[PDB]
């Protein structure tokens, strides 16, 4: 309960008191790269600090080792540190070798020399950071006040409690303490929503902040639908609150329009054809099996029934027939039910600026992700790759400014190419039966084939994994086994291995709805790594992604088979 939802304001005031100055820079923000929510939140914070004239620095880091190396070089003149996208799960004081008594410069409690704020959404929390540390402070959103009721008592009372009742109680409370741990990890909220709450508390909300909040929230749709369904009504309310007025007389080159219009679960509808949108969709592919000939024939039959000529459905959206575009909603409503695709109809947010063209939030986040993925003796080889991944962050950052639209178009083209490549690899995976069904998990190792140099980036492998999980969720086979995806890099001679959680069908009822399936690959990987001298690298922010040498892959996986917890 360090900083509650209501308390978010006062912490800001502290940053205004210690850091703001016209002759020195004393605020540093460490933001997790390869993440869209963190990027949007950092953009909002940067604009806020720019308005109040507070000097700042933004440093994109990739892993925990980078953070540890950068913390030492950081001076004592920097009074404020902001860790965005990470830091909640691990013990920060032990990791950074922070001595509480060393940081007291304002003797009295202790005001302390430096303040570190943690803005993260990866549960479970670390009990040490929440309940036992004073230098480390976190922006909580209501997990502790409700979920961690007995944990606080156990922690504090075990700290203070340190003749047979003593032995009994200490054991049956360390049992509860270990019960809190040994649990998988999920995401339950979004950073951009919390920053928008801070904005509303201070009172600096506008259309740009709302657009950034929508962009941050939308990115969670593919992996965590429950959070999106929870946060959507508040976004709808805030959109209606900030509408300029009624009866807009004329469209002028300076109008901005944020509208709630009906959209569809289709891949880049307004920047490609209709046939392409239906072809390269995860949901349509899962529901119709387009990778073989039968799915393509079924799609052709559907398009024939709907009344759209096959020649017209392959034209660009701008140059598509006006009459067909006008009546698309009725045609969808009356025909989509026969083929099980009635779930593709939804409502979203569309933004328009003058005589330019309309863009939806989903297309924007796909363009940003595409810009993240592609843009612009083995240790150096990995270092160069990580440096390029850091470099792509500024390319994605620039695309959020209204002046740079050519970069957004480039991102759209890159997204189209990337999705085509993912589809091409997925059909090969599915046709040759490369997926092996073990008792505990399902294995997929890509050793040979073209364009394996695209899967050295975690985001592309997550794309392919999301394709495969979506394909498996709608399969009639009923199972919830986690999946393992491994990809080789010849230059480094290392496999990059990722563990992926199962997902329920998109349209399934809410009776099973709960806190989603927990990811248990981090604990298993740590358990196997500790016991054996395997040449593995666990250094990414996502604990479910590791880099294992080629020789160790086949034995390590065997150990995983007996590890359990999967």
């Amino acid at each position: 309960m360090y900083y509650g939802i209501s308390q978010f304001s006062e912490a800001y005031n502290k940053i205004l008191r210690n850091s703001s100055s016209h002759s020195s820079c004393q605020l540093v923000i460490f933001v997790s790269c390869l993440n869209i929510d963190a990027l949007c939140a950092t953009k909002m914070l940067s604009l806020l600090f720019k308005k109040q004239l507070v000097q700042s620095q933004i440093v994109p880091i990739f892993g925990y080792s980078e953070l540890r190396r950068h913390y030492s070089q950081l001076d004592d003149n920097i009074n404020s540190l902001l860790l965005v996208g990470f830091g909640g799960v691990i013990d920060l004081e032990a990791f950074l070798e922070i001595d509480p008594q060393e940081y007291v410069i304002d003797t009295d409690e202790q005001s302390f020399r430096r303040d570190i704020y943690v803005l993260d959404a990866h549960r479970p929390w670390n009990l040490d950071n929440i309940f036992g540390s004073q230098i480390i402070q976190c922006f909580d959103d209501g997990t502790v006040d409700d979920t961690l009721g007995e944990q606080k008592e156990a922690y504090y009372k075990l700290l203070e409690l340190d003749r047979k009742q003593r032995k009994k109680q200490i054991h049956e409370y360390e049992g509860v303490l270990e019960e809190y741990y040994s649990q998988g990890t999920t995401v339950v909220n979004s950073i951009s929503a919390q920053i928008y709450s801070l904005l509303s508390a201070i009172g600096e909300t506008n259309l740009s902040n709302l657009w950034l909040n929508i962009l941050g929230t939308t990115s969670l749709d593919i992996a965590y639908a429950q959070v999106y369904n929870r946060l959507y009504p508040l976004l709808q309310d805030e959109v209606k609150r900030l509408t300029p007025s009624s009866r807009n007389s004329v469209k002028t080159p300076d109008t901005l329009t944020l509208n709630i219009q009906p959209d569809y679960y289709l891949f880049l509808l307004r920047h490609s054809s209709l046939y392409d949108s239906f072809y390269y969709s995860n949901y349509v592919n899962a529901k119709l099996s387009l990778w073989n000939e039968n799915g393509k024939k079924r799609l052709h039959k559907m398009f024939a029934r709907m009344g759209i000529p096959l020649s017209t459905a392959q034209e660009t959206w701008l140059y598509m027939d006006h009459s067909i575009k006008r009546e698309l909603g009725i045609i969808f409503d009356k025909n989509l039910d026969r083929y099980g695709l009635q779930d593709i109809i939804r409502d979203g947010f569309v933004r328009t600026l003058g005589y330019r063209g309309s863009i939806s939030a989903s297309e924007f986040v796909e363009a940003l992700t595409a810009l993240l993925e592609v843009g612009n003796n083995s240790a150096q080889k990995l270092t160069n790759l990580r440096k390029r991944w850091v470099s792509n962050f500024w390319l994605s950052w620039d695309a959020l400014d209204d002046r740079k639209v050519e970069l957004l178009n480039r991102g759209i083209q890159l997204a189209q190419d990337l999705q085509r490549a993912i589809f091409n690899t997925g059909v090969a995976i599915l046709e040759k039966k490369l997926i092996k069904h073990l008792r505990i998990y399902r294995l997929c190792v890509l050793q040979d084939g073209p364009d394996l140099d695209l899967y050295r980036n975690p985001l592309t492998l997550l794309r392919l994994g999301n394709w495969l999980i979506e394909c498996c969720a709608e399969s009639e086979d009923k199972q919830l086994l986690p999946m393992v995806l491994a990809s080789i890099d010849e230059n480094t001679d290392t496999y990059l291995v990722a563990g992926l959680t199962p997902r329920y069908p998109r349209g399934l009822d809410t009776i099973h709805t709960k806190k989603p399936i927990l990811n248990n690959f981090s604990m298993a990987f740590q358990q196997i790594t500790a016991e054996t001298d395997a040449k593995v690298r666990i250094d990414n922010f996502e604990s479910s992604i590791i880099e294992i040498r080629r020789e160790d892959l086949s034995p390590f996986l065997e150990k995983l088979t007996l590890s359990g917890l999967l």
Binding site: R17, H22, I105, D106
Partner: protein
């Protein structure tokens, strides 16, 4: 005088006249001294407040300078000093380039006995050192490179009797844009040069002898004119180069 605003106005008008003029204008000795003294005192002043604010902060973990009525004044001091320094820097470098262009002409002016123009008035002391050093360095370069292999008849870098004159002089008939301010301060009746015209404000008169014509310049109008016929008016602040 005794007005800090008029010093900045005079510096700006001198810079504007300097950039657009062909010749090497006289140096405003007093104005530069006053401005340099003012800058020297002002920098010490901002340094003093900065030190005073810093020292008290570390003593007893006191609060920083309270934000209201604090930051904006000092920020304005800094930016104002920055702008003034830029203006003076541009003025000095432009006149140094013009000095570079006319080294031999200035030397010939200084060497002439019956010349009212003297380098002690037209050139600053640092500019005198610059001129002397640059002339010697350039002479050494040309003597070592080319002029050593030449007959004694023609070994002079300044030859006014050769086929082509080797000493370049300022263009006295360059065309410039001018604005007619009128009297520098006022008292339109006091100025003898002012003469009224039909249904109009008083206008200056000038003569072009090569064309042999009389040109009238009305107050408040912008003209494109020869530089020689307007030298006296510019020297007396009646006209301003735009």
């Amino acid at each position: 005088y005794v007005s800090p605003q008029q010093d900045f106005s005079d510096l700006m008008k001198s810079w504007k006249n300097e950039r657009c003029s062909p010749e090497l204008l006289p140096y405003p000795h007093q104005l530069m001294k006053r401005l340099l003294n003012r800058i020297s005192m002002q920098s010490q002043l901002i340094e003093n407040i900065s030190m005073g604010f810093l020292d008290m902060q570390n003593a007893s973990n006191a609060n920083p300078p309270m934000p209201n009525e604090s930051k904006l004044p000092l920020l304005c001091m800094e930016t104002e000093l920055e702008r003034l320094k830029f203006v003076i820097r541009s003025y000095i470098r432009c006149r140094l380039s013009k000095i570079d262009k006319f080294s031999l002409y200035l030397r010939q002016l200084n060497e002439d006995e019956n010349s009212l123009i003297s380098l002690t008035d037209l050139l600053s002391k640092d500019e005198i050192k610059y001129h002397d050093t640059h002339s010697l360095i350039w002479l050494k370069l040309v003597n070592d490179s080319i002029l050593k292999y030449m007959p004694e008849e023609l070994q002079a870098i300044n030859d006014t009797e050769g086929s082509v004159n080797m000493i370049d002089e300022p263009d006295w008939n360059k065309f410039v844009f001018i604005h007619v301010n009128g009297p520098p301060d006022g008292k339109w009746n006091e100025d003898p040069l002012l003469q009224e015209n039909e249904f109009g404000k008083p206008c200056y008169t000038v003569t072009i002898p090569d064309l042999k014509e009389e040109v009238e310049l009305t107050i408040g109008s912008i003209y494109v004119m020869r530089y020689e016929v307007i030298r006296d008016l510019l020297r007396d602040d009646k006209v301003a180069l735009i």
